[PDB]
Amino acid sequence: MTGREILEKLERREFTREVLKEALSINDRGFNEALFKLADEIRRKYVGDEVHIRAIIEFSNVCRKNCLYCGLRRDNKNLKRYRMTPEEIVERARLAVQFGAKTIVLQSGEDPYXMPDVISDIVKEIKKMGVAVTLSLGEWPREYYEKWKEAGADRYLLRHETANPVLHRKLRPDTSFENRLNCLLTLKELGYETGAGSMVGLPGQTIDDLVDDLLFLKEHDFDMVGIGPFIPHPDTPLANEKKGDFTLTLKMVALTRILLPDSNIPATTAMGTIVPGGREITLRCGANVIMPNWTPSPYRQLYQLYPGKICVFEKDTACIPCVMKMIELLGRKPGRDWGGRKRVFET
Numbered sequence: 001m002t003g004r005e006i007l008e009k010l011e012r013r014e015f016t017r018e019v020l021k022e023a024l025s026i027n028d029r030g031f032n033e034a035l036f037k038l039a040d041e042i043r044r045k046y047v048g049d050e051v052h053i054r055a056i057i058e059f060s061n062v063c064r065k066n067c068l069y070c071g072l073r074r075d076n077k078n079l080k081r082y083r084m085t086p087e088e089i090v091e092r093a094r095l096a097v098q099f100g101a102k103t104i105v106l107q108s109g110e111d112p113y114x115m116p117d118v119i120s121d122i123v124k125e126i127k128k129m130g131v132a133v134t135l136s137l138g139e140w141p142r143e144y145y146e147k148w149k150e151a152g153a154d155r156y157l158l159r160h161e162t163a164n165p166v167l168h169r170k171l172r173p174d175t176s177f178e179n180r181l182n183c184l185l186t187l188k189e190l191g192y193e194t195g196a197g198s199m200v201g202l203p204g205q206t207i208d209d210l211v212d213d214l215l216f217l218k219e220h221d222f223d224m225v226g227i228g229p230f231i232p233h234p235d236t237p238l239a240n241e242k243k244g245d246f247t248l249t250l251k252m253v254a255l256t257r258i259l260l261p262d263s264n265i266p267a268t269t270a271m272g273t274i275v276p277g278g279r280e281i282t283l284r285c286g287a288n289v290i291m292p293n294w295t296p297s298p299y300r301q302l303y304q305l306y307p308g309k310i311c312v313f314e315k316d317t318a319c320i321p322c323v324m325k326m327i328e329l330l331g332r333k334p335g336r337d338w339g340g341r342k343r344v345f346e347t
């Protein structure tokens, strides 16, 4: 099909494997621009002009897992490890709420020390502040997820990474796609707003794999979808692999918006790392969420899933103001409420 025909099928919601594969394979500038315009318009119509701010506190870079892509993998001895105290985390969340954040995201490596009860205690304290709490702590037993939901957690981010089970097991040798999916299903069952998503440009990942990632996301109707490029880290086995392409990754975000029109979709920091101004582009191609870094010094610079991350050299409190300026210069509005998913039931 020509680009014009692919676009027409996307506009009529004929989301076949073939339409998605062709959308990802056509490299014509005119087609891509039209795809991005469509996704921007769908975003505007379904989720409006509010860009929701999720302040992220990366509270520990200790991890028990050994994912091949990740700078926090347990085999990386060239990394100073750190843990914020529970008091530090609560007070740092309070400062973000003082700065206007309406969601606090707590993210870490899979660090056993906190699990499950110290997390529960932190969540209960933050919930007193009248904001949404999102956890992004990795894979844990059902019982831990249940405890955190009873403590008041609202949302959980657990990117599926890659929907190719073979590639998933190779890159994540401690676990499996089946396990990852079972965690996501358990989180949904428990009443979390649940986020999935994937990296683009992983070694060995194909276009057909990206199509499978889109169809997976569409299948499960996730509340949130986090997408970014793979960025190689020098202290990992994938150090010499190519970085994911920004344009391809942006097309994944655009297609995700077209597929899941009422979902919450961040403009990720990895997008702003590989291209200067990449978050702002992504916010104009389907995204409607931003996650300003709220990790304090001196830890911020130690939380390096990938290198060269933007924002690391800035003062503690810079990123909330910075994203508020971004949202204004984009002609957008800050979120007025917690920014939970507002489902638009259709046919």
Ligand SMILES: C[C@H](CCC(=O)NCCC[N+](C)(C)CCCS(=O)(=O)[O-])[C@H]1CC[C@H]2[C@@H]3[C@H](O)C[C@@H]4C[C@H](O)CC[C@]4(C)[C@H]3C[C@H](O)[C@]12C
Pocket: 032, 033, 034, 036, 037, 038, 040, 041, 281, 284, 285
């Ligand atoms: C800003 C640049 C360069 C534009 C440019 O420089 N040309 C425009 C100003 C031309 N003027 C109208 C002021 C004067 C014309 C008379 S003149 O005689 O001066 O040329 C234009 C050229 C292509 C545009 C992107 C694509 O669409 C894809 C996508 C659609 C989304 O929905 C919004 C996001 C995104 C990324 C777009 C953003 C932006 O919009 C771009 C980069």
Ligand SMILES: C[C@H](CCC(=O)NCCC[N+](C)(C)CCCS(=O)(=O)[O-])[C@H]1CC[C@H]2[C@@H]3[C@H](O)C[C@@H]4C[C@H](O)CC[C@]4(C)[C@H]3C[C@H](O)[C@]12C
Pocket: 097, 098, 099, 100, 101, 320, 321, 324
């Ligand atoms: C934290 C300190 C000290 C006072 C304090 O502890 N303030 C708690 C405010 C709590 N809220 C955010 C929920 C108020 C919402 C009011 S609002 O009327 O916006 O709905 C206060 C004093 C001045 C405040 C900044 C300025 O103002 C400019 C700007 C306005 C944006 O908007 C949000 C960002 C920013 C940078 C502000 C952040 C923060 O706030 C500051 C630093």
Ligand SMILES: Nc1ncnc2c1ncn2[C@@H]1O[C@H](CSCC[C@H](N)C(=O)O)[C@@H](O)[C@H]1O
Pocket: 069, 070, 071, 107, 108, 109, 110, 136, 137, 138, 139, 157, 158, 159, 161, 198, 199, 228, 229, 230, 231, 232, 233, 270, 305, 306
């Ligand atoms: N090298 C790299 N490049 C780009 N993104 C990466 C990366 N290493 C990790 N990430 C991404 O960062 C996300 C958060 S990792 C932190 C939370 C948790 N340990 C977890 O694994 O879910 C991952 O889901 C992955 O998609």
Ligand SMILES: O=C(O)[C@@H]1CSCN1
Pocket: 226, 228, 268, 269, 270, 271, 291, 305
């Ligand atoms: O892009 C990033 O850096 C982070 C990783 S998971 C949330 N976004």
Ligand code: SF4
Pocket: 063, 064, 065, 066, 067, 070, 071, 072, 073, 074, 108, 109, 110, 138, 305
């Ligand atoms: S991706 Fe998450 S689980 Fe895997 S090594 Fe990094 S921090 Fe640990």
Ligand code: FES
Pocket: 292, 293, 310, 311, 314, 318, 319, 320, 322, 323
């Ligand atoms: S969002 Fe971090 S300094 Fe701009």
Ligand SMILES: [Cl-]
Pocket: 054, 103, 105, 134, 155
């Ligand atoms: Cl969130």
Ligand SMILES: [Cl-]
Pocket: 225, 226, 227, 266, 268
């Ligand atoms: Cl994300």
Ligand SMILES: [S]
Pocket: 318, 321, 322, 323, 325
């Ligand atoms: S900023």
